[PDB]
Symmetry: D2
Subunit: 337 residues, 4 copies
Amino acid sequence: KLKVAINGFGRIGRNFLRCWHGRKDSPLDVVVINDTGGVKQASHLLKYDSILGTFDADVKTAGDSAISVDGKVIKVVSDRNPVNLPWGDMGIDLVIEGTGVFVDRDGAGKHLQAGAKKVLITAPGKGDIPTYVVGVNEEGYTHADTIISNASCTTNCLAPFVKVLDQKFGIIKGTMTTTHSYTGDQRLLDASHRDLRRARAACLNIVPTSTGAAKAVALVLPNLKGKLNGIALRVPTPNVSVVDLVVQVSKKTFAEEVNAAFRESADNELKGILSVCDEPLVSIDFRCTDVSSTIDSSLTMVMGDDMVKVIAWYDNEWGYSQRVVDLADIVANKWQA
Amino acid sequence: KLKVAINGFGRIGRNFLRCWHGRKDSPLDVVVINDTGGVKQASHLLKYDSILGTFDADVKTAGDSAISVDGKVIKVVSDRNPVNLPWGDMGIDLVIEGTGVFVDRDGAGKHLQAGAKKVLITAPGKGDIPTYVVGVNEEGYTHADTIISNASCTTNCLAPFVKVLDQKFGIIKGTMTTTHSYTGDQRLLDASHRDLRRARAACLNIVPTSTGAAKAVALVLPNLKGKLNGIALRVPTPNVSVVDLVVQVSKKTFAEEVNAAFRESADNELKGILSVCDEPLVSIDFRCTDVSSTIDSSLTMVMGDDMVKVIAWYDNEWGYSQRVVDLADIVANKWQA
Amino acid sequence: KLKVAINGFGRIGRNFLRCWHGRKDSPLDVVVINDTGGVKQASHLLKYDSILGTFDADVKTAGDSAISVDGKVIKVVSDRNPVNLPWGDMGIDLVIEGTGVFVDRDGAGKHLQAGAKKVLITAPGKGDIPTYVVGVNEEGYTHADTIISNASCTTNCLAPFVKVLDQKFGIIKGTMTTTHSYTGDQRLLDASHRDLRRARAACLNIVPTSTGAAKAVALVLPNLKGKLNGIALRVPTPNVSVVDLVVQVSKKTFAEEVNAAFRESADNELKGILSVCDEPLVSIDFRCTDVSSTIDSSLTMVMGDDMVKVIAWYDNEWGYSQRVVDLADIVANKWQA
Amino acid sequence: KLKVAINGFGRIGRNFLRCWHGRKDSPLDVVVINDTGGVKQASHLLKYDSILGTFDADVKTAGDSAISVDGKVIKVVSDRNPVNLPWGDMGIDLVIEGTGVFVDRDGAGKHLQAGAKKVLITAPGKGDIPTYVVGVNEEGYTHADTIISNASCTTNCLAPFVKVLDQKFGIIKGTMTTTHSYTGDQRLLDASHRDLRRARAACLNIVPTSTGAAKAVALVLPNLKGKLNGIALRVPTPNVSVVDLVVQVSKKTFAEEVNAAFRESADNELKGILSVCDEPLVSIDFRCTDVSSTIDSSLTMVMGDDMVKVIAWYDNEWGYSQRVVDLADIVANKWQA
Ligand SMILES: NC(=O)c1ccc[n+]([C@@H]2O[C@H](COP(=O)([O-])OP(=O)(O)OC[C@H]3O[C@@H](n4cnc5c(N)ncnc54)[C@H](O)[C@@H]3O)[C@@H](O)[C@H]2O)c1
Ligand SMILES: NC(=O)c1ccc[n+]([C@@H]2O[C@H](COP(=O)([O-])OP(=O)(O)OC[C@H]3O[C@@H](n4cnc5c(N)ncnc54)[C@H](O)[C@@H]3O)[C@@H](O)[C@H]2O)c1
Ligand SMILES: NC(=O)c1ccc[n+]([C@@H]2O[C@H](COP(=O)([O-])OP(=O)(O)OC[C@H]3O[C@@H](n4cnc5c(N)ncnc54)[C@H](O)[C@@H]3O)[C@@H](O)[C@H]2O)c1
Ligand SMILES: NC(=O)c1ccc[n+]([C@@H]2O[C@H](COP(=O)([O-])OP(=O)(O)OC[C@H]3O[C@@H](n4cnc5c(N)ncnc54)[C@H](O)[C@@H]3O)[C@@H](O)[C@H]2O)c1
């Protein structure tokens, strides 16, 4: 019922389409896809995926301007400048901005200039753009927001349990490190890049790099403003990442008590968002998990009674994409966005 | 003495600079580097390399327009359009075209429009562009050629021993497959690309893809016109590749006889170009080899007395780059190019 | 109905169990599993698999001597010497020998000494052991065979279409190279090994190594005795391999004609064994395919009218395992083995 | 002058030999090598190494019982049981125990039973075995120790700067996570292992696993007893690892002040042990570094004025091996060990 447009049919754009496809009675209607590549690629790459496997659905090209998934035809256009997009003419309600190059107001605002009524950025927004994390602060969303951000994948993994730690133990200060799978923003082989570290061969190195995910947490949990920071360590895995959080808390506690608090929420307010795994698994076992964060209970540690360490898993592609769909659903539910 | 300009400071551009740097009494004088990135990257990536290791030389940035290697300053400019380059103003004799995007006459000819006297493409040339392979047909080079090609890496590996097989046994017809390391032209993760196979995650797949290296062989060895063809299989290794050649020959022979013929040439006319290894090594052992082709003698096979199979190694980055330097030296020796 | 025992619960043993599990009305009854590890590992590794994903079935440990899959309990023992196994006492009909260390008559014969009635080696047999390839020579199997071999994975991929090429064009001589995923027989990091090449880090090199798969083809297709040979090139992919066959044939032909011959058989006598793919896919797309060989039609080439080159894919773990189940079914059908 | 024997010619054994080889005026004389493999492997693997490259020295086999490096012959034996070793008969002073299977007193004591005067374990010792970390507590070593441990690689990376943080700021409590390269103790493909996580394919996963390196730190810095803990995250890189330490300190401070303290020591008491890097490098750039720990100054962070986070690099193979040589030198200097 909500006319949706996907801008940037990459890793997130395609995972988004597939997540949506598997949902029942969706309020969303994906009608257009805009990428710079062509219709043959959109169709081919949607069907075959080195990470998700072959898409269990009939995907084919429809003429020279559309693709069809199980019969449902989807228009495909190719305009590098968002202002030239036929959003107005098609009556596009919501644009899923996943190109990674229009994350600020002037850039994302271009979809509005093209006629779309609203924009949902699949990444942190730069400047003054409301950012939401489903299960943490989504309720503060209002239909008046013309441009919104669904934060980064690491923020969606961290925020959920950070919220629990803060509510139950009181976070004084903390730090975090994410051992993250590589992404398209890194180079296959040493090549130019503004980030001198992300410029080095991704599958051959442990690559330190910045992340705002920690500061970003404060955007959705204001009580943590100026209390967290961290970095990212990119490693040679194609998908699935893990966060390592260390915080000093006010209430003395111990590992199993902390784990118990997470199960409490995982069974209630954070059901579907946060999960707690008690099996000794490795990254690949968490591929395709719908939650945005899974605590590895056995790794939980507590030093000096108030220094808590939590290790949580997250499928940065699929889990995050379930959240974008989730946020899109909310936008659909708060009146024709 | 020959004023040289490098256009495209990528894998080949940087290996070129380092190969040149290690040569004694070079006729070449590298004075300019043009890439789209900046001076900080040029300096940083020249010094640190995930494949060659840290460059054993003092590399640093010089102001905002140059880098210096052991004191020798090198101008660094950044122009995406070759026609705007200061080749004429600087009096550039030879431009090493290694961007991979100006391989035809109109594109490479743009360096000429900018003032450079000659262009050496570090890849197969499209259209009517003389192509040479040092040790196979370099002697046919004339200073009149304004634009020349040094062929592809696979051609420089194949041509040398193909020439021996043809001279000694008479090649009737043949085919070839190169199990090739991935390159910057492939995608880190499934992403758009004109080649639907090269679009898939490079470090997760065996990726079939086209190669003209086989037909290209006929350009340097006319006697083989229409006698060879093949394909490339890209695999998850960052550097070093291997060719697998299968040919039906006129003179009946046997493996050790074929190997012997290769050592004959490797010790004479092809010394420095072709090598023959009798040790049971693996790809990484061939990293940084100066030759452009190394026969793995023990893998040589002969079926039905006339079907010869040869397996040869090659450092597609460094070995090929030694050849570009070699061809540049020839250009310097045939009068101020 | 056939009491089956799995000896060596490794890659093949576990894929075997899962292939079997997905079959309908199987004549096989897996009752025992013998590995050297324990019951916790058998259960854990059967459930979580870095290549197949999490097993969609209820797997758990049952006491200290068994595991259960969806309720069906399976005895688990741990004896390094096959002669001490309780095959006789349990009345084991067929032993699936997949340890890789009992491939000759004296070694595999030990299961017989322990009481098992028959042994099916999941690899080439050394010495005088009947070897079969489903779809090529299975019909020559007789219940009198006490020890049989299902050949190697590469043989099961090659034999099927080799048979077609021979029947329709007449193979004079040929050679082959398989660009193969690494296996447990290779070392993670340079370490001792009888094979000086398989001793080198598997995920960092292209590793040449021997293969009898070519000569082995003659065992199942006697008409090809002494007409084929080849080698293996191990590369950094965890599963799925590809064969590259080059043969000189008697009848002149051309690529599309050869492809057509393969579709003829793929639709008839080799249905379920051989498949022909016309899409430009990469290795990961062939993961979990039930056939044992898939021709990449677009890569097919023909030089000098009689030199045919065919490129075929194969899931060396899963596809091969479907064949072991298949051969086990045949053994069950030819009287209580 | 000190007769040294290497037991276990694996990654550490071979790096040890090469580190030693590059030292000047060494007090050590390596005369025997005992591994289970053969003389051909010892020679071959010492010469060709997927991580260090080809050994720049003349290595060859000498008969069927020795290898020679640049002329120096070294006896090679093969006994799986240390008690059968000819240590006494050869008059072996010190045995470098690097097999990873004799880390407790009864197991390592077997070399003593064979006649060796002393044993140096290239890993944490289990039970009551003095453990030393060069640059932290080596001075407490006495010749009376018959069996000693050089700790783990992570301990040698952590202890050095931990000592500085404690001396200058007072460590109250802390935790640590090492994003570690995989090692021979992990499986190439999902296979049985006592550790259910280390049993999963190493090059395909981020693998959590235990480490005593944190508790081990207290062995060499008693002041930190019961103040630290942590875990290891194994990732798909063949060599070089990184430690992430988070501690609450007594004296309020800030990042650059902490970095300054490290340079103070790196220029004095810890020169050659601890280094401080100010360049934005990635793991591969730290390959072959002789120090055992290199602080990445730009990643240093301080939260709430007393929570310090330090990121340090370390070549777990080569850097650690320089330390074993170093500890061996000390043993040689404290009288004929
Ligand atoms: N990969 C992840 O795990 C991940 C997780 C969370 C958030 N994100 C965010 O999502 C965004 C996209 O990430 P991705 O990994 O999918 O990248 P990607 O490279 O796979 O996808 C970007 C896509 O946009 C297209 N594109 C680029 N410029 C365009 C333009 N001007 N007009 C139209 N199409 C254009 C590309 O061709 C490509 O298909 C980034 O902002 C990233 O930070 C990524
Ligand atoms: N990598 C190999 O093994 C190899 C071997 C032989 C031949 N080649 C050929 O060499 C060429 C480059 O290959 P590469 O692997 O070094 O690639 P690369 O991506 O590492 O290098 C290309 C470089 O050119 C720059 N560039 C791109 N467009 C530009 C423009 N318009 N103006 C200026 N600079 C521009 C890029 O920023 C980059 O630094 C290709 O033609 C390739 O076929 C590569
Ligand atoms: N991986 C493949 O693609 C593949 C394909 C076709 C055929 N094969 C053949 O299958 C066999 C096994 O290969 P794999 O890859 O599954 O190896 P693997 O290492 O994963 O499995 C071997 C298993 O046998 C166990 N084992 C070893 N020695 C034993 C003993 N004495 N008693 C009991 N258990 C013992 C091991 O602990 C392990 O679980 C080999 O003969 C191989 O050539 C493998
Ligand atoms: N790789 C690293 O980074 C590293 C770093 C620090 C400490 N260590 C420690 O060093 C030890 C060895 O580690 P590694 O990585 O070199 O392993 P490795 O597998 O490469 O080497 C072990 C070697 O010992 C041999 N061996 C095994 N059992 C034997 C026996 N009974 N008798 C004789 N030789 C035997 C093996 O054949 C092999 O050559 C372990 O204790 C490990 O914890 C390893």
